[PDB]
């Protein structure tokens, strides 16, 4: 509505299940959380210091 954008779909559910099926420590790893999602519409990725 305002320039805010909020992703309501996540596509890695299949990958997430697969990674979980191995072991408890596979799904709860930090690296299970780093799996990326496509960006919201258009938009410009940047880092500020």
């Amino acid at each position: 509505w305002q320039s805010y954008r909020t992703r309501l779909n996540t596509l890695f559910a299949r990958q997430l299940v697969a990674r979980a099926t191995t072991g408890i420590d596979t799904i709860l790893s930090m690296e299970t959380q780093n799996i990326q999602e496509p960006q919201l519409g258009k938009g410009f990725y940047a880092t500020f210091v």
Binding site: R19, T22, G23, D25, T26, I27, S29, E31, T32
Partner: protein, 47 residues
């Protein structure tokens, strides 16, 4: 047998296969060998 070629793979907590580099595999050989065995006979493995 020492300094002979050897291959290894890491299995991390979450399941992943990381192939071992000849230098790594070697440095694990040095303390590893004599826990594994020759023809017809077998040894045991430990940490």
């Amino acid at each position: 047998y020492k300094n002979a070629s050897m291959q290894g793979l890491y299995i991390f907590a979450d399941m992943a296969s990381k192939d071992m580099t000849p230098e790594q595999s070697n440095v694990y050989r040095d303390n590893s060998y004599q826990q594994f065995d020759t023809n017809n006979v077998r040894r045991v493995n430990n940490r």
